[PDB]
Design an enzyme around this catalytic site. Structure first.
Site, mmCIF file in Angstrom:
data_model
loop_
_atom_site.group_PDB
_atom_site.id
_atom_site.type_symbol
_atom_site.label_atom_id
_atom_site.label_comp_id
_atom_site.label_asym_id
_atom_site.label_seq_id
_atom_site.Cartn_x
_atom_site.Cartn_y
_atom_site.Cartn_z
ATOM 1 N N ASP A 31 38.016 48.443 44.468
ATOM 2 C CA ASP A 31 37.726 47.655 43.275
ATOM 3 C C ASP A 31 37.852 48.365 41.929
ATOM 4 O O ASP A 31 37.038 49.219 41.597
ATOM 5 C CB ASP A 31 36.299 47.106 43.458
ATOM 6 C CG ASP A 31 35.796 46.319 42.268
ATOM 7 O OD1 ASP A 31 34.555 46.169 42.164
ATOM 8 O OD2 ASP A 31 36.614 45.847 41.453
ATOM 9 N N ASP A 215 41.301 43.459 37.704
ATOM 10 C CA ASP A 215 40.355 43.661 38.791
ATOM 11 C C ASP A 215 40.847 43.478 40.228
ATOM 12 O O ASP A 215 40.912 42.353 40.721
ATOM 13 C CB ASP A 215 39.194 42.703 38.529
ATOM 14 C CG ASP A 215 37.950 43.094 39.243
ATOM 15 O OD1 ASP A 215 36.930 42.419 39.008
ATOM 16 O OD2 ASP A 215 37.992 44.069 40.028
#
Length: 329
Positions: A31, A215
């Protein structure tokens, strides 16, 4: 070094890492939106069903483990985890690094019972790390083994390789054309300026500019509640509790959505953002674009997740604080 990723329903992309001696294996999502590393802990009460359904790190079975014990809570957009810090050797894509990570002892059934992965490996900057824990990528760079201070993401279509992360560079095999970079607004966050968002024929969104958080940990492309309301109204989509739907028969008819980034237009077709499950007018089909209000200082901001990355191979350049995009192959 590359990490092989598994694609679960086009919403969860995860690879494997090994922690401890002997190695204890874990499925984790990489992430760019967060900076901490964490996996479920053997010390997690089995009253947390999510802990019953995931691999648990047991420190008493690792001879390389180093105790710390500092308490930490990690707050994500869709959920929270809490536990304590620990140190041990982590194996990632062939590279071995000593790393401080979180052992989670509180992991809510919703949403973690729905998680295919066990934990998360933050790829963000140390400025966003909770408890000021050195991020795993900074630790790898400190070894001075990578040929470049950059990492790249390739997310495949659902099919059924699920995807791939390259530490140290990019894989020409999964992209074509050349990269087009956008400088980071600031170090510490993989966020970039977005000049505008257009739907069909009417740049009725993000006029005057806005922010875009690249993201890899986000399943979808997200915008603030106000922005998404407009975008959806324009699409003829109906809102539900957790998403937006459209009658399936009209999924293929939905207009293109474009994202102006660094002087280049990144365009998605309806096939790119709608989960075309069927074509019946008696069924509803979800869209891979959601409403998500990301709190300051990082937000408000749009979030470019898997829906976007599937279309564009993404390179995160730490040496030049920039992000590069190229047509995924």
């Amino acid at each position: 070094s590359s990490v092989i990723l598994t694609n679960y329903m086009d919403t969860q992309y995860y690879g494997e890492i090994g922690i401890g001696t002997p190695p204890q294996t874990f499925k984790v999502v990489f992430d760019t939106g967060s900076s901490n590393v964490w996996v479920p802990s053997s010390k997690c009460s089995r009253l947390y069903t999510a802990c019953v359904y995931h691999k648990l790190f047991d420190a008493s079975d690792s001879s390389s483990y180093k105790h710390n014990g500092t308490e930490l809570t990690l707050r994500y957009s869709t959920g929270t985890v809490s536990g304590f810090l620990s140190q041990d050797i982590i194996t990632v894509g062939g590279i071995t690094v000593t790393q401080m990570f979180g052992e989670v002892t509180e992991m809510p059934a919703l949403p973690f019972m729905l998680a295919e992965f066990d934990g998360v490996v933050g790829m963000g900057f140390i400025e966003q790390a909770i408890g000021r824990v050195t991020p795993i990528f900074d630790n790898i760079i400190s070894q001075g083994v990578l040929k470049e201070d950059v990492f790249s993401f390739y997310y495949n279509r659902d099919s059924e390789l699920g995807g791939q992360i390259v530490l140290g560079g990019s894989d020409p095999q999964h992209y074509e054309g050349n990269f087009h970079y956008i400088n980071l607004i600031k170090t510490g966050v993989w966020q970039i300026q977005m000049k505008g968002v257009s739907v069909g024929s009417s740049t009725l969104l993000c006029e005057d500019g806005c922010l875009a958080l690249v993201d890899t940990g986000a399943s979808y492309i997200s915008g603030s509640t106000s922005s998404i309301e407009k975008l959806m109204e324009a699409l003829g989509a109906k809102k539900r509790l957790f998403d937006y739907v459209v009658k399936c028969n009209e999924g293929p008819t939905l207009p293109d959505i474009s994202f102006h980034l660094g002087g280049k237009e990144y365009t998605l077709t309806s096939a790119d953002y709608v989960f075309q499950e069927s074509y019946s007018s008696k069924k509803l089909c979800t869209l891979a674009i959601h409403a998500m209000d990301i709190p300051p200082p990082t937000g408000p901001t749009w979030a470019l997740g898997a829906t976007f990355i599937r279309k564009f191979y993404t390179e995160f350049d730490r040496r030049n604080n920039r992000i590069g995009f190229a047509l995924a192959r």
